Every structure is written in structure tokens, then in C-alpha cells.
Design a protein around this ligand. Structure first.
Ligand SMILES: CCCCCCCC/C=C/CCCCCCCC(=O)OC[C@H](O)CO
Ligand SMILES: CCCCCCCC/C=C/CCCCCCCC(=O)OC[C@H](O)CO
Ligand SMILES: CCCCCCCC/C=C\CCCCCCCC(=O)OC[C@H](O)CO
Ligand SMILES: CCCCCCCC/C=C\CCCCCCCC(=O)OC[C@H](O)CO
Ligand SMILES: CCCCCCCC/C=C\CCCCCCCC(=O)OC[C@H](O)CO
Ligand SMILES: CCCCCCCC/C=C\CCCCCCCC(=O)OC[C@H](O)CO
Lengths: 448, 448
């Protein structure tokens, strides 16, 4: 049955499934069988560590952030269940398993018609696409309209990996990798718009503040590890922790700033030989068709700037939630892994924390406002998965709940808040246009 | 008073308290302030990662070994509770908190009287000493004899750090570091005996199964990472796991071989700048004498040749427990980290799996046999700690329970089985004599 062969391939995990597809690629690419095996193990090993550092993030940074929001006594009565809560609900929809073959086919069609360079192999991030269908299915009521949302969610991110290819390869050091999924990509265009505006504003276009400058004025006290200690201290202090817990958390936050890059290196260390052999064999067929592998946006968290933005925005997002007019959602389950949101924002600004701070507030305010506009649809998905206890408490999430993709599609096929559609649609649409044009220059520059 | 501050110094953690001593020492050495902080933080990051990888060993390789051993739940009716059960029991003894100052004073007296060169900073593995005293207290009924056993254990392990210092540097890369605590060091004298016997037998002295020889023969299939995958497959199969869990475990058993070296390096990188400055200042004052810092035995598992033996000996330590004469103890809790038993054996035999296998079988048989002869004390150590029911189920553990130190100390002051005292004491005593000679030989070679 399709469901078993999929639910077996799904529950197999990236620890096993992804190595095999990478090994099978090298075996048919005339690579020595031992060398092909060696890469697959490293790719899986990196994912084991990636689950470990992220496990540290959600079990030490998460508890503190979840306590800061409660300590900051506000009126926000709806709690961000986060992507740890959104994904289980999304996998309970009737389109959960039918989306995975659909997304590949949209990729396969686009690959043949020369509409994408991304050959996605991360079949686990499709829950983001299922989320767009799930909320459309709830609002519209058409099984096809939900399926169409999956195709749109797939085709968009497949090009979101194309448009951020130089940013992933040159800034994050991920050659041949495209990061199409997750908040890092689909909120990327918002940052491409902000950095576009700032560059044309005089004076504002000359303000800089990179983490390298902190090390060029403080030394050991400006090193990324040291910042991970001080910021970890404040997160514990602002959460009412005792001096023991504050001191203990700070090293764990610092340990992220060192271990996280080390756990993502195995994937790069193993993917390098396969790409070069394939690049030595596919340039003579398809013709210079530099392909890209689609992987988890977790590989973007191995940047010292991203982790610094992640810890810095833990208190900021709680304040952005208060300030943001119209918001009723309290940040919670997505506060630990919040560098996912502002990841590609740092890449666009190339390290300028000044623009990263401006982008993040715009990013967080919009995602917090959108999640407030999807509380009703989100709570139905929770009920449609058994996650709604007898309380009936409103269920909302910043991940996928505040997605412009999922929102702009629902508000188009329903026409509830046209004013919301116009403002968000123009804001996101311009960002998509500017993100697409930036890649056009990049291709012409490199080729010539 | 003392108990309150002791727990606070203890509960603050190896991640927070060890940086404090390191930071203060560098400030004492007139080192730069920020340069002192950076070394302290990296050590904490090192111990954060150690807990993460040592938790993957316990939570993934553990249940696999706990499943293989369950086949023999019928013959061996006493279960090795392991160090995850022996350590808590030993921390409830009356001699627990008093053992920290007692062991530090012994180190000071031995350091001042120029009897040892180890400056132990792991005030957390002192429970091994408290275990020796506690069982002596249960057996002899004397508080003094319990304290005497603590001091004798402290004196032996402090001397064990000196005598196994070349191995920790030449074979492990832990310069200026001694590993005095743990099953690795105090069963090391057995390995020195096995090497001596084999090197005197003709033909058997010329058998080499080293890791490097494995790599040239196999290639990428003999590399440390690939070896862990293969053994992870067998461990999964022998535990009755499904095909997927066999494959999922195998990548995680290989991830330990790669991730563990990279979580201990921050401790090395933090301690290195301090060691050279301490050499620069204290050289002339202390007569050009080289000191060693005493840390956890977990830094010995960063050797790919040890993790392999930690997987190879998971089935063997079980199979040994069926043929060992007079064994009522089923290995269990210590199997996930069984490399903690044969660590220094790998260094003495210089990574020769032939001599490691012969040595390891001797060590496990002796510990399993001794663990059978210490059950009554262990079952009372649980009763006095509250970890017991009225069922009559007996408690045993190969960690500290099957310890030659605790057994020989108990059997000397009680004289229950004089035959067992003579046999274990002779083999251990001959080994200690061979171990001390090794230190004298190496020091004279250094002067040359
Ligand atoms: C630069 C590239 C990107 C450009 C992006 C431009 C803005 C996109 C927004 C579209 C929403 C348009 C309005 C949708 C509704 C149309 C009118 C309608 O049907 O309204 C019915 C309602 O009942 C009346 O009150
Ligand atoms: C290989 C090592 C060789 C060298 C080994 C050297 C050992 C030195 C021991 C000193 C402890 C002296 C005994 C201290 C016991 C005090 C007990 C006590 O307090 O007794 C009164 C109490 O009320 C009763 O319950
Ligand atoms: C152009 C072709 C459009 C249609 C392609 C197939 C759509 C899939 C339907 C899955 C649910 C079926 C019930
Ligand atoms: C632009 C890309 C268009 C892609 C159309 C995909 C249509 C649906 C396929 C469902 C396959 C289910 C198996
Ligand atoms: C339930 C029965 C109806 C199912 C309709 C499925 C339509 C799917 C794809 C539309 C084209 C997408 C491109
Ligand atoms: C043989 C090497 C030197 C041995 C030094 C032994 C120091 C014992 C200290 C305190 C225990 C006193 C009794 C506590 C009850």
C-alpha cells in the first residue's frame, strides 16, 4: 500500500532515507562503492548531531524563553504552539501523505521544463506545504483547492531555493545546496525588500555593525562564544532563574555557538566528492546545468550571526508581540528555534546587525499578525487531530500559522480581508519580485 | 553549612564550577582577563557536548544491549545496575559529602610530600572512592575503616594518574591531563600484565590487528566512522531489532565515533594556553617539574579505537558472563559504555585488537566474578539508600562493584575468602608492580 511504503520511508528518517538516496546517486555515478557509503554515513551523522543541538536548544533555551513570555504579563491569551505543535497536526490531515508524491511531481515537472535547479530530497519538510493545503481545505472546503495550494507552496519554495542559492553557497558555505523550506526561505523576500530600501536611503545605507566589528573592538569578549554566554545569562535572568541556572544556561547557549557548526560539517564533508564527480559528468550532458540539493533549513543555524540573532530576538519577539497592533498571539513554542525566522535575513544584509534588527521586527510583526488572522483555521486543524482538550483554548502558531504563503492563498480564495490581502500581497509580492531580480544579476555576473 | 555549600559547589556542575577554577588559575598565572574567560567557556562547551554524546550512547546503544542480555534473564538472575545506579546509591552514604575534603586533603598531602603529580579537579568521580568506603563500612561495621578505604582509594587513583600519564598524552592527546578516576584506570594494571605475558610468548608477540592495518586492508570500509556503522548493524540485529531500527542505530553508533572526538577538543583547546603559561611561570619555582590535571575518564572515549571496543565487547561481556565460573550477575547498565572498562588496555597494547580482546576477557571475567561476590553489600547499599523493595531482588553492578580495589580492601579487613584475597591480590599486585615499572622506565627514557 502507498501509505505504508510512504509511512515506512517517512518514519525511516533522514538518518537512513537520505543517505540511501545519496548513496544510490553515487553508485550510478561511477563512484567507488566504499566512497559512496562513506558520504551517506556522514550525511546521516550530521543529522544525528543536528537533532542533538536542536534538542539542546528546545530543552534549555526553550524553557527559559517560555518563562520570559509568562513573566512578561500581557494580555496575549493565545499561545504559540510552535512548529513542534504545528507539524503533528499537519501530518494528521487527509492530504498529509498524498502531498509528498505531489510535491516531487511538481519538482519533476519543473526540473524537466527547466523551471527549477532544486532537486529536493527532504521529504520531511513537506508538512509546510500540507499546512497551506490544510488551512485552504478548512476555509474553502474543496479537496482540489487544498491540493492546488500544495502545488503553489511547492513551486514557490522550489524557486525560493533557486533565488537564495548564492546566499546559501557564499554566506553559509553550502555549495550545491539549496534551502527551500521553512521560515528561513519564505520570509527571506521580506528581508530582500528591507535591504533593497535601505541601500537607497542615504546615511542609513552606510550604518554598519557586524559581529566581526565586535571582535575588532573587544577581542575575546567579542568572540561569538562570549556573546553566547552573556546573551544566555540575560535570557536566564529575564526568566527569573537563580544564579546557578543562569550560569548553567549561558554555557549551553554558548555551546550552541560552537557545536552547531561542527554538527553540520559532516554533510558538507560528504557531499563535496559526489557533487564534483557529478559536475564532471553532467556538464557534458545537460550542459552547465548546475543543480542544487534541497535540504533542511537547520543547516542555516550553524552561522554565528544567525545564532546571535536567534538569542537576541528571544526577548525582542516578546516585545514585538506586544507592540504589533492587532496581535493576540503570545510567542512560545517557536522562541527557542527563532533563528529559523531571521536566518536568510542575515544573509541578505551580509552580517549587518543593524538591518537584521529592522528586518526582524517587520518579519515578527507580520508573522504575529498573520497568526492572529489564522487562529480560527489553526484551531480547527487542532480539533481535526485531537489536540483540542475540553478547554477549547484558541490554538495558534508562528510557524506556518504566520506564513504569508498559507495566508495569502486563504485570503484569496475566500476574500475575507481584502485590505489584509492588498497590504500583505503587495509587501510579499514586491519581495518576490526583488528576490527574483537579484538572482538574475548573480547568474550573469558569475557566468561572464 | 558545609553540606549546603558542598552541594552548591557540586550542583553547579562540571560545566560551571570547573571553568571557575580554570578562570581563577589563569588570573593567578597573570594571564589576560578575556583570555582566561575564553578558556573557561570552551571547557564548559566541551562538557556540554560530552553529556550529549554520552547520552546518545546510553539512550541508543543501551536499550540494544539491554535487549541482548534479556535472553539470559533466566540463568543470571542478578542484574548489573551499572554506574547510572551505583553512583546515586553511593551519594546517599553518610561518607558522601565528607569524602570530598578527605580526598582533596589526601591529594594536597601527597602533592606537598612529592608523592603525586596529579591535581584532581573532578570532585564528581569521588563517588568511586565513597563506594569503596561504603562497602567497607557495611562489611566491617567501622566508620574509620570506611574512611581508610576512601584514602587508600584516593592514594591509588592519584598514583594511577601518574603511572598512566604517557598513555593519556601519547595515545590520547591529553597533554598535562591525567585520568585517575574510573574503571578505565583501576583495571589498567590488569592490561599491563596481559601485555607482559604475551610479549614473552614467541609468535604471539608478533600479532598485529591495529586500526591502521584495518584501513589499508579495507579502505573506506575500515575507517572509524564506517566501522561503527557495521557494528551498529550487528548490535541491532542481535537485539532483535527490526530492519529500520538496525539501520537507524547503526548511523548513531557511527555518529558517536565522530562526534565524541569533536566535543572533547574544546576542553583541550581551552586548557592548552593555560598549560604553557603555567610551564613558563612555575618551571623554575617547582624545579622544572611537570604537573597533571585530573579530569573525567570520558575524554578517553574520544579515541575511535575505544568506541569500537565499546561496541565489540557489548556481546562478549555478555557471552563471558555465561561461561565465567560462579557468575550470578547479568551485565546490563554498564554495557552502553563498556569502553569505560578497557580504555587504558587499548593504550597499553597500542591499539592491538588481538591483545585488547585477550585483556578485555580477563577484565570482564574478574569484574563479573567479583561483582557476584559483592552482591550482599550492594543490596544493602540500596536498602540504606531506599532503592529496594521487599521482593528479595538482589543488587549488583560491575562498575565499582566488581572493583579489585573495593574487593581487596573488604577481603583484607574482613578475611571472608582468604583464597580470593590471595588470588586477586597477587594478580593485581603483580600488575601494579609492572605498572609502576612502566612509569620508571618512561621517565628514565625522557631524561635520555
Ligand atoms: C510588484 C509585484 C507584486 C504586485 C502586488 C500587488 C498587490 C497584490 C494584491 C492583490 C489583492 C487585490 C484585491 C483582491 C480583491 C479584488 C476585489 C474584490 O473582488 O473585492 C470583493 C469585495 O467584496 C469588495 O468589497
Ligand atoms: C595505598 C595507601 C596507603 C596509605 C593509606 C593511609 C590511610 C590514612 C587514613 C586516615 C584516616 C584515619 C581514620 C579516621 C577515622 C575517623 C572516624 C571517626 O570520626 O570516629 C568517630 C566516629 O564517631 C565513629 O562513628
Ligand atoms: C494536470 C493534472 C491535474 C490532476 C493531477 C492529479 C491530482 C491528484 C489528486 C490526488 C487526490 C485524488 C483523490
Ligand atoms: C508548475 C508545476 C505544475 C505541476 C503540476 C502537478 C499536478 C499534480 C500532480 C499530482 C501527482 C500525484 C501523484
Ligand atoms: C476528492 C475528489 C476531487 C479531487 C480533485 C483533485 C484535484 C487535484 C489537482 C488539481 C490541479 C492542480 C495543479
Ligand atoms: C598516604 C597519603 C596521605 C594520606 C593523608 C590522609 C588525610 C586524611 C584526612 C582526613 C580524614 C580525617 C578523619 C575524618 C573523619
Amino acid at each position: 500500500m502507498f501509505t505504508e511504503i510512504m509511512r515506512y520511508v517517512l518514519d525511516l528518517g533522514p538518518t537512513v532515507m537520505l543517505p540511501i538516496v545519496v548513496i544510490l546517486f553515487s553508485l550510478l555515478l561511477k563512484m567507488k562503492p566504499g566512497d559512496a557509503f562513506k558520504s551517506g554515513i556522514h550525511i546521516g551523522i550530521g543529522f544525528v548531531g543536528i537533532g542533538l543541538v536542536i534538542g539542546l536548544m528546545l530543552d534549555s533555551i526553550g524553557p527559559a524563553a517560555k518563562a520570559m513570555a509568562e513573566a512578561f504579563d500581557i494580555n496575549l491569551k493565545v499561545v504559540d504552539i510552535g512548529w513542534p505543535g504545528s507539524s503533528p497536526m499537519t501530518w494528521a490531515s487527509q492530504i498529509a501523505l498524498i502531498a509528498i508524491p505531489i510535491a516531487i511531481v511538481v519538482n519533476l515537472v519543473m526540473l524537466m521544463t527547466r523551471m527549477t535547479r532544486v532537486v529536493n530530497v527532504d521529504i520531511w519538510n513537506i508538512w509546510h506545504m500540507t499546512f497551506t493545503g490544510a488551512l485552504v481545505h478548512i476555509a474553502t472546503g474543496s479537496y482540489a483547492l487544498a491540493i492546488v495550494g500544495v502545488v503553489v507552496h511547492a513551486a514557490f519554495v522550489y524557486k525560493l531555493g533557486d533565488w537564495f542559492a548564492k546566499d546559501t553557497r557564499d554566506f553559509f558555505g553550502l555549495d550545491g545546496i539549496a534551502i527551500p523550506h521553512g521560515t528561513s526561505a519564505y520570509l527571506g523576500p521580506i528581508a530582500v525588500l528591507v535591504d533593497t530600501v535601505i541601500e537607497k536611503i542615504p546615511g542609513l545605507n552606510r550604518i554598519h555593525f557586524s559581529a566581526d566589528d565586535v571582535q575588532k573592538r573587544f577581542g575575546a569578549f567579542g568572540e561569538p562564544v562570549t556573546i553566547g554566554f552573556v546573551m544566555g545569562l540575560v535570557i536566564g535572568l529575564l526568566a527569573g532563574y537563580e544564579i546557578k541556572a543562569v550560569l548553567q544556561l549561558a554555557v549551553k547557549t554558548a555551546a550552541v555557538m560552537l557545536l552547531m557548526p561542527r554538527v553540520i560539517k559532516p554533510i558538507m564533508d560528504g557531499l563535496t566528492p559526489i557533487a564534483k564527480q557529478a559536475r564532471s559528468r553532467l556538464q557534458a550532458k545537460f550542459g552547465g546545468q548546475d543543480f542544487l540539493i534541497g535540504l533542511d533549513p537547520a543547516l542555516l543555524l550553524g552561522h554565528t550571526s544567525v545564532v546571535s540573532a536567534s538569542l537576541i530576538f528571544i526577548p525582542l519577539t516578546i516585545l514585538i508581540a506586544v507592540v504589533t497592533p492587532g496581535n493576540q498571539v503570545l510567542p512560545f513554542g517557536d522562541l527557542a528555534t527563532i533563528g529559523f525566522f531571521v536566518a536568510m535575513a542575515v544573509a541578505v544584509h551580509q552580517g549587518n546587525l543593524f538591518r537584521t534588527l529592522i528586518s526582524g521586527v517587520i518579519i515578527m510583526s507580520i508573522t504575529l499578525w498573520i497568526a492572529t488572522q489564522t487562529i480560527g483555521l489553526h484551531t480547527q486543524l487542532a480539533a481535526n487531530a485531537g489536540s483540542l482538550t475540553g478547554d477549547g483554548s484558541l490554538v495558534a502558531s508562528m510557524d506556518q500559522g504566520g506564513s504569508p504563503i498559507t495566508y495569502l492563498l486563504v485570503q484569496a480564495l475566500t476574500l475575507e480581508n481584502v485590505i489584509g490581502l492588498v497590504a500583505i500581497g503587495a509587501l510579499y509580492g514586491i519581495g518576490i519580485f526583488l528576490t527574483w531580480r537579484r538572482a538574475k544579476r548573480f547568474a550573469a555576473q558569475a557566468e561572464s
